[model samples]
Target: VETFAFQAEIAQLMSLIINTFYSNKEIFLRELISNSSDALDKIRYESLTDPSKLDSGKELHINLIPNKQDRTLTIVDTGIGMTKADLINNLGTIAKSGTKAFMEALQAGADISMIGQFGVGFYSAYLVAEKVTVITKHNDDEQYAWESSAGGSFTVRTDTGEPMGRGTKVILHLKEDQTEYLEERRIKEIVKKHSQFIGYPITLFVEK
Candidate 1:
């Protein structure tokens, strides 16, 4: 397992996103799903250029698995998954790595560029989650997991869980006050508001 810090200029910026996103925490889903949608498109886009990348025949779709019992909300997408470098560069740094700029962009509907901003959308995950766990498999490489508490660092390791095909699965260990995200009703509304126009099917599971 390899562990690394959240960009040297990241902590303060991260705190800004988490604290300022009080009533706007829902944007987290939009940004993440936006990433998934783009990732899904990228796979297809890349396939046209280099058909060598495979999808394992899985249809392109997004899945939401919320576990209230576990206080976790997971977003899964059968998109062009990321490699280890992506986990580091994408998750490790937010492009140039800043959040106040993103918040400004977001408020103006500024299209802060999806995770396309290279994972800036992800920092919003810290608004509600105490920890974030990512399991991703790329068409050209093996599966891996990236976990972090948005603390000081994150860790990346070869996935030891059941094998995964090409996709990205993100698990947010919700904070004590953010348990509402685990509710299907809440998530459905957020999805409808922000991602209803995306062409792919997004399914949410029913759990006990």
Candidate 2:
């Protein structure tokens, strides 16, 4: 695994948000869901040009897994997973994916939605998680893990766990006070309130 320091601006922004912006920690879930929805939307857009993009039954969807024993909540999306460049720019550099190209190419509506969610929403994970582990595998590249725990440093290495099919998986190591999010009812409430209008089905594997 290789390690790198976060971009200076990203460090400052992360510190400000982690320290001040999370008074209402519930926004983390909403933001996480919205981020995944946007990712799914992107793949759907791409699939329009190449039907093979969804050839493997790559249904656009999201999955939430709350493991109380591990005290971790995971959000996985079947979307256009990030490549190395994406992991670096999107997660590390405050969203400068040369978005101008995509921005100009998109039509007037749904595609425009990526702008708002691309850079900011993912950081909300820091609001509740002491550590965030993102494992992703894009169709065109190998699997990788992008992990960060406090401070302004993160590590990215080839993922060694089970082979990822295709998409991104984010595991949030919840902070002690954020355990409420591991509860089934709490997640349901948040989802119903914030993501009910989301287009794709969001299946949650939670305890009773």
Candidate 3:
């Protein structure tokens, strides 16, 4: 029912994010799924005290799918889905946010850790994806489909289908320059390396 514009400063920062390419594009998936794990941790940590808000059976897990035929990589998670405000705040700004606090924690003590601190991490997807689609269902709100091309803007709208159960699915339409990501074997290795110690089940499809 309502929409707004990103500030000029934030828009400039966003432009920088989309233009810059990362040294290791594979790291994009690693970062995204890592963020998902952290989101799950946040909810789980709180649920211990607020039992009515979450269920014990909600398995914290991440699933990776590499579709070579379509040159797309999908990462799915049973974690806390972002609300509209979270999406705006997280995607629109990094400074003066939880991301900033996360950075401060790391600076004070290296042992401190939190996913999505950079706020820049999500934009890393543009390093690999020509288009990105987010399908998510929030337990406390309506489901949404957010799509973007790392162009000037993004679109968020209500989802078409029934809600997915308490989770998020991110599909990366890989760029022509990044064909290696379409390889299931390679992605599986990256998944294991970055997410092995993560406190959740991580499943991915691999080809022989």
Reference-based lDDT, each prediction: 0.79, 0.78, 0.69
Candidate 2 lDDT by residue in tens digits, 94-176: 44342333334343443322334445657668888999999998876899999999598988898989876788899999999
Ranking by lDDT: 1, 2, 3
| Alpha carbon lDDT at 4, candidate 1 | 87
| lDDT minimum window of 10 residues, candidate 1 | 110-119
lDDT of 3 by residue, 119-205 (tens): 546656776788888888767787788877754566777787756777788999988988888786777788777666888888877
Model 1 misplacement above 4 A? 49-52, 90-94, 97-119
Clashing pairs in 1: none
Model 3: ten consecutive residues of lowest lDDT: 110-119
lDDT of 1 at 21: 31
Best by lDDT: 1
Extract clashing residue pairs from model 2.
none
Which 10-residue window of candidate 2 scores lowest in summed lDDT?
107-116
